[PDB]
Coordinates of N, CA, C and O and ligand atoms in Angstrom, one line a residue:
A1 N 0.9 -1.2 0.0 CA 0.0 0.0 0.0 C 0.9 1.3 0.0 O 2.0 1.2 0.5
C2 N 0.4 2.3 -0.6 CA 1.2 3.6 -0.6 C 1.0 4.4 0.7 O -0.2 4.5 1.1
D3 N 2.0 5.0 1.2 CA 1.8 5.9 2.3 C 1.2 7.2 1.7 O 0.4 7.8 2.4
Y4 N 1.7 7.6 0.6 CA 1.2 8.8 0.0 C 0.9 8.5 -1.5 O 1.7 7.9 -2.1
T5 N -0.3 8.9 -2.0 CA -0.6 8.6 -3.4 C -0.8 10.0 -4.1 O -1.7 10.7 -3.8
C6 N 0.1 10.3 -5.1 CA 0.0 11.5 -5.8 C -0.4 11.3 -7.2 O 0.4 11.0 -8.1
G7 N -1.7 11.3 -7.5 CA -2.2 10.9 -8.8 C -1.8 9.4 -8.9 O -2.5 8.6 -8.2
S8 N -1.0 9.0 -9.8 CA -0.7 7.6 -9.9 C 0.7 7.2 -9.3 O 1.1 6.1 -9.4
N9 N 1.4 8.2 -8.8 CA 2.7 8.0 -8.2 C 2.5 7.5 -6.7 O 1.8 8.1 -5.9
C10 N 3.2 6.5 -6.4 CA 3.0 5.8 -5.0 C 4.3 6.0 -4.2 O 5.4 5.6 -4.7
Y11 N 4.2 6.6 -3.0 CA 5.4 6.8 -2.2 C 5.2 6.1 -0.8 O 4.1 6.1 -0.3
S12 N 6.3 5.6 -0.3 CA 6.3 5.1 1.0 C 6.9 6.2 1.9 O 7.5 7.2 1.4
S13 N 6.8 6.0 3.2 CA 7.4 7.0 4.2 C 8.9 7.2 4.0 O 9.4 8.3 4.2
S14 N 9.5 6.1 3.7 CA 10.9 6.0 3.3 C 11.4 6.9 2.2 O 12.3 7.7 2.2
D15 N 10.6 6.9 1.1 CA 10.8 7.8 0.0 C 10.7 9.3 0.4 O 11.5 10.1 0.0
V16 N 9.7 9.5 1.2 CA 9.5 10.9 1.7 C 10.6 11.4 2.6 O 11.1 12.4 2.4
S17 N 11.0 10.5 3.6 CA 12.1 10.9 4.4 C 13.4 11.2 3.7 O 14.2 12.1 3.9
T18 N 13.7 10.3 2.7 CA 14.9 10.5 1.9 C 14.8 11.8 1.1 O 15.8 12.5 1.1
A19 N 13.7 12.1 0.5 CA 13.6 13.3 -0.3 C 13.8 14.5 0.6 O 14.6 15.4 0.4
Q20 N 13.0 14.5 1.7 CA 13.1 15.6 2.7 C 14.5 15.8 3.3 O 14.8 17.0 3.4
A21 N 15.2 14.8 3.6 CA 16.6 15.0 4.1 C 17.5 15.7 3.1 O 18.2 16.6 3.5
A22 N 17.4 15.4 1.8 CA 18.2 16.0 0.8 C 17.8 17.5 0.7 O 18.7 18.3 0.6
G23 N 16.5 17.8 0.7 CA 16.0 19.2 0.5 C 16.4 20.0 1.7 O 16.9 21.1 1.6
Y24 N 16.2 19.4 2.9 CA 16.6 20.2 4.1 C 18.1 20.5 4.2 O 18.5 21.6 4.6
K25 N 19.0 19.6 3.8 CA 20.4 19.8 3.8 C 20.8 21.0 2.9 O 21.5 21.9 3.3
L26 N 20.2 21.0 1.7 CA 20.5 22.2 0.8 C 20.0 23.5 1.4 O 20.6 24.5 1.3
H27 N 18.8 23.4 2.0 CA 18.2 24.6 2.7 C 19.2 25.1 3.8 O 19.4 26.3 3.8
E28 N 19.6 24.2 4.6 CA 20.5 24.6 5.7 C 21.8 25.2 5.2 O 22.4 26.1 5.8
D29 N 22.4 24.7 4.0 CA 23.6 25.2 3.5 C 23.5 26.4 2.6 O 24.5 27.0 2.1
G30 N 22.2 26.9 2.3 CA 22.0 28.0 1.4 C 22.2 27.8 -0.1 O 22.7 28.7 -0.7
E31 N 22.1 26.5 -0.5 CA 22.3 26.2 -1.9 C 21.0 25.7 -2.5 O 20.1 25.3 -1.9
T32 N 21.0 25.8 -3.9 CA 19.8 25.3 -4.6 C 20.2 24.5 -5.8 O 21.4 24.5 -6.2
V33 N 19.2 23.8 -6.4 CA 19.5 23.1 -7.6 C 18.2 23.2 -8.6 O 17.1 23.3 -8.1
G34 N 18.6 23.1 -9.9 CA 17.5 23.2 -10.9 C 17.3 24.6 -11.3 O 17.6 25.6 -10.6
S35 N 16.6 24.8 -12.4 CA 16.2 26.1 -12.9 C 15.2 26.8 -12.1 O 15.1 28.1 -12.1
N36 N 14.4 26.1 -11.3 CA 13.4 26.7 -10.4 C 14.0 26.9 -9.0 O 13.2 27.2 -8.1
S37 N 15.3 26.7 -8.8 CA 15.9 26.8 -7.5 C 15.3 26.1 -6.3 O 14.8 26.8 -5.4
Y38 N 15.3 24.8 -6.3 CA 14.8 24.0 -5.2 C 16.0 23.8 -4.2 O 17.1 23.6 -4.6
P39 N 15.6 23.7 -2.9 CA 14.3 24.0 -2.4 C 14.0 25.5 -2.3 O 14.9 26.3 -2.1
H40 N 12.7 25.9 -2.4 CA 12.4 27.3 -2.3 C 11.2 27.5 -1.4 O 10.5 26.5 -1.1
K41 N 10.9 28.7 -1.0 CA 9.7 28.9 -0.1 C 8.4 28.4 -0.8 O 8.2 28.5 -2.0
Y42 N 7.6 27.8 0.0 CA 6.2 27.4 -0.4 C 5.3 28.3 0.3 O 5.3 28.4 1.5
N43 N 4.5 29.2 -0.4 CA 3.7 30.2 0.3 C 2.4 29.7 0.8 O 1.8 30.5 1.6
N44 N 1.9 28.5 0.5 CA 0.7 28.0 0.9 C -0.5 28.9 0.5 O -1.4 29.2 1.2
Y45 N -0.5 29.3 -0.8 CA -1.6 30.0 -1.4 C -2.9 29.2 -1.4 O -4.0 29.7 -1.3
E46 N -2.7 27.9 -1.4 CA -3.8 26.9 -1.4 C -4.5 26.9 0.0 O -5.6 26.5 0.1
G47 N -3.8 27.2 1.0 CA -4.3 27.3 2.4 C -4.5 25.9 3.0 O -5.5 25.7 3.7
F48 N -3.5 25.0 2.9 CA -3.6 23.7 3.5 C -3.5 23.9 5.0 O -2.8 24.9 5.4
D49 N -4.1 23.1 5.8 CA -4.1 23.2 7.2 C -3.0 22.3 7.8 O -3.2 21.4 8.5
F50 N -1.7 22.7 7.5 CA -0.6 21.9 8.0 C -0.5 22.0 9.5 O -0.7 23.0 10.1
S51 N -0.2 20.9 10.1 CA 0.0 20.8 11.6 C 1.2 21.4 12.1 O 1.3 21.5 13.4
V52 N 2.2 21.7 11.3 CA 3.5 22.3 11.8 C 3.5 23.7 11.3 O 2.8 24.1 10.4
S53 N 4.4 24.5 11.9 CA 4.3 26.0 11.6 C 5.3 26.4 10.4 O 6.2 25.7 10.1
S54 N 4.9 27.5 9.8 CA 5.7 28.1 8.7 C 6.9 28.6 9.4 O 7.0 28.6 10.6
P55 N 7.9 29.0 8.6 CA 7.8 29.0 7.2 C 7.9 27.7 6.6 O 8.5 26.8 7.2
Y56 N 7.4 27.4 5.4 CA 7.5 26.2 4.7 C 8.3 26.2 3.4 O 8.4 27.3 2.8
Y57 N 9.0 25.1 3.1 CA 9.8 25.0 1.9 C 9.3 23.7 1.1 O 8.9 22.8 1.7
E58 N 9.5 23.8 -0.2 CA 9.1 22.6 -1.1 C 10.3 22.1 -1.8 O 11.2 22.8 -2.1
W59 N 10.3 20.8 -2.0 CA 11.4 20.1 -2.7 C 10.8 19.0 -3.5 O 9.9 18.3 -3.0
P60 N 11.2 18.7 -4.8 CA 10.7 17.7 -5.6 C 10.9 16.3 -5.0 O 12.0 16.0 -4.5
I61 N 10.0 15.4 -5.1 CA 10.1 14.0 -4.8 C 9.7 13.3 -6.1 O 8.8 13.7 -6.8
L62 N 10.6 12.3 -6.5 CA 10.5 11.8 -7.8 C 10.0 10.3 -7.8 O 10.4 9.5 -7.0
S63 N 9.1 10.0 -8.8 CA 8.6 8.6 -8.8 C 9.7 7.6 -9.2 O 9.5 6.4 -9.0
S64 N 10.8 8.0 -9.7 CA 11.9 7.1 -10.1 C 12.6 6.5 -8.8 O 13.2 5.5 -8.9
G65 N 12.5 7.2 -7.7 CA 13.1 6.8 -6.4 C 14.4 7.6 -6.3 O 15.1 7.5 -5.2
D66 N 14.9 8.3 -7.3 CA 16.1 9.0 -7.2 C 15.9 10.3 -6.4 O 14.8 10.8 -6.5
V67 N 17.0 10.9 -5.9 CA 16.8 12.2 -5.2 C 16.9 13.3 -6.4 O 17.7 13.1 -7.3
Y68 N 16.1 14.4 -6.3 CA 16.2 15.4 -7.3 C 17.6 16.0 -7.4 O 18.2 16.5 -6.4
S69 N 18.1 16.1 -8.6 CA 19.4 16.8 -8.8 C 19.4 17.7 -10.0 O 20.5 18.1 -10.4
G70 N 18.2 18.1 -10.4 CA 18.2 19.1 -11.5 C 17.3 18.5 -12.7 O 17.0 17.4 -12.7
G71 N 17.0 19.4 -13.7 CA 16.2 18.9 -14.8 C 14.7 18.9 -14.2 O 14.4 19.6 -13.2
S72 N 13.9 18.2 -14.9 CA 12.4 18.3 -14.6 C 12.1 17.7 -13.3 O 12.5 16.7 -12.9
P73 N 11.4 18.5 -12.5 CA 11.0 18.2 -11.1 C 9.8 17.3 -11.0 O 9.5 16.8 -10.0
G74 N 9.1 17.1 -12.1 CA 7.8 16.3 -12.1 C 6.7 17.1 -11.4 O 6.9 18.3 -11.1
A75 N 5.7 16.5 -11.0 CA 4.6 17.2 -10.4 C 4.5 17.2 -8.9 O 3.7 17.9 -8.3
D76 N 5.3 16.3 -8.2 CA 5.2 16.0 -6.8 C 6.2 16.7 -5.9 O 7.4 16.8 -6.3
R77 N 5.7 17.1 -4.7 CA 6.6 17.8 -3.8 C 6.5 17.3 -2.3 O 5.4 17.0 -1.9
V78 N 7.6 17.5 -1.6 CA 7.5 17.3 -0.1 C 7.7 18.7 0.4 O 8.4 19.6 -0.2
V79 N 6.9 19.1 1.4 CA 6.9 20.4 2.1 C 7.4 20.2 3.5 O 6.8 19.4 4.2
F80 N 8.5 20.9 3.9 CA 9.0 20.7 5.2 C 9.2 22.1 5.8 O 9.2 23.1 5.0
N81 N 9.5 22.2 7.1 CA 9.6 23.5 7.7 C 11.1 23.8 8.1 O 12.0 22.9 8.0
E82 N 11.3 24.9 8.9 CA 12.6 25.2 9.4 C 13.2 24.2 10.4 O 14.4 24.2 10.5
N83 N 12.3 23.5 11.1 CA 12.8 22.5 12.0 C 13.0 21.1 11.4 O 13.1 20.1 12.1
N84 N 12.8 21.0 10.1 CA 12.9 19.8 9.3 C 11.7 18.9 9.8 O 11.8 17.7 9.9
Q85 N 10.5 19.5 9.9 CA 9.3 18.7 10.3 C 8.6 18.6 8.9 O 8.4 19.6 8.2
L86 N 8.1 17.4 8.6 CA 7.3 17.2 7.4 C 5.9 17.9 7.6 O 5.3 17.6 8.5
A87 N 5.5 18.8 6.7 CA 4.2 19.4 6.7 C 3.2 18.6 5.9 O 2.1 18.4 6.3
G88 N 3.7 18.1 4.7 CA 2.8 17.3 3.9 C 3.4 17.0 2.5 O 4.5 17.5 2.2
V89 N 2.7 16.2 1.7 CA 3.2 15.8 0.4 C 2.1 16.3 -0.6 O 0.9 16.0 -0.3
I90 N 2.5 17.1 -1.5 CA 1.5 17.7 -2.4 C 1.9 17.5 -3.9 O 3.0 17.1 -4.2
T91 N 0.9 17.8 -4.8 CA 1.1 17.6 -6.2 C 0.3 18.5 -7.1 O -0.8 18.9 -6.8
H92 N 0.9 18.8 -8.2 CA 0.1 19.5 -9.3 C -0.8 18.6 -10.0 O -1.6 19.1 -10.8
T93 N -0.6 17.3 -9.9 CA -1.5 16.3 -10.6 C -2.9 16.4 -10.2 O -3.2 16.3 -9.0
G94 N -3.9 16.6 -11.1 CA -5.3 16.6 -10.7 C -5.7 18.0 -10.2 O -6.8 18.2 -9.6
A95 N -4.8 19.0 -10.4 CA -5.1 20.4 -9.9 C -5.0 21.3 -11.1 O -4.2 21.0 -12.0
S96 N -5.8 22.4 -11.2 CA -5.7 23.2 -12.4 C -4.5 24.1 -12.4 O -4.0 24.5 -11.3
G97 N -3.9 24.3 -13.6 CA -2.8 25.2 -13.8 C -1.6 24.8 -12.9 O -1.2 23.6 -12.9
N98 N -1.0 25.7 -12.2 CA 0.1 25.5 -11.3 C -0.4 25.4 -9.8 O 0.4 25.6 -8.9
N99 N -1.7 25.1 -9.6 CA -2.1 24.9 -8.2 C -1.6 23.5 -7.7 O -1.1 22.7 -8.5
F100 N -1.9 23.2 -6.5 CA -1.6 21.9 -5.8 C -2.8 21.3 -5.1 O -3.6 22.1 -4.7
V101 N -2.7 20.0 -4.9 CA -3.7 19.4 -4.1 C -2.9 18.4 -3.2 O -1.7 18.1 -3.5
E102 N -3.4 17.9 -2.1 CA -2.7 17.1 -1.2 C -2.6 15.6 -1.8 O -3.5 15.2 -2.4
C103 N -1.5 15.0 -1.5 CA -1.4 13.6 -1.9 C -2.2 12.8 -0.8 O -2.3 13.3 0.3
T104 N -2.8 11.7 -1.2 CA -3.7 11.0 -0.2 C -3.1 9.8 0.4 O -2.0 9.4 -0.1
Ligands
LIG1 N1 0.4 26.8 -6.3 C1 1.4 27.3 -5.6 N2 2.6 27.6 -6.1 C2 3.5 28.0 -5.3 C3 3.3 28.3 -3.9 N3 4.5 28.8 -3.4 C4 5.3 28.8 -4.4 N4 4.8 28.3 -5.6 C5 5.4 28.6 -6.9 O1 4.7 29.8 -7.3 C6 4.5 29.7 -8.7 C7 3.0 29.5 -9.0 O2 2.6 28.1 -9.0 C8 5.4 28.6 -9.1 O3 6.7 29.2 -9.0 C9 5.3 27.6 -7.9 O4 6.5 26.8 -7.9 P1 6.7 25.2 -8.0 O5 6.4 24.5 -9.3 O6 8.2 25.1 -7.8 O7 5.9 24.8 -6.8 C10 2.1 28.0 -3.3 O8 1.8 28.2 -2.1 N5 1.1 27.5 -4.2
LIG2 CA1 9.6 3.9 -3.6

């Protein structure tokens, strides 16, 4: 069973922890990767009711199982905060334009 289902992409907790650790490390060091500069702030324009506090950051999580290192980020993201607490796993899949919906 999937811990998080983003459209048809299936993630375990392990996938999420791995992606989040990479994104948080870059965040801590002040470095980014890719043309969209990940990780970057996530403004929560959608207004998700995250259980942890802002500020929030987003980092791509890939269905290949690899950690994001540039190139296309796909549709899915992990959102973490300043304390490296996971806020949620979100996706552009099934959402209009560049909006997001929560992975289930
Ligand atoms: N939909 C949405 N996009 C956000 C938010 N915060 C940042 N973004 C970024 O704002 C622009 C509009 O979607 C894009 O740069 C998107 O980038 P990402 O694709 O990297 O998430 C947010 O809270 N909601
Ligand atoms: Ca996996």
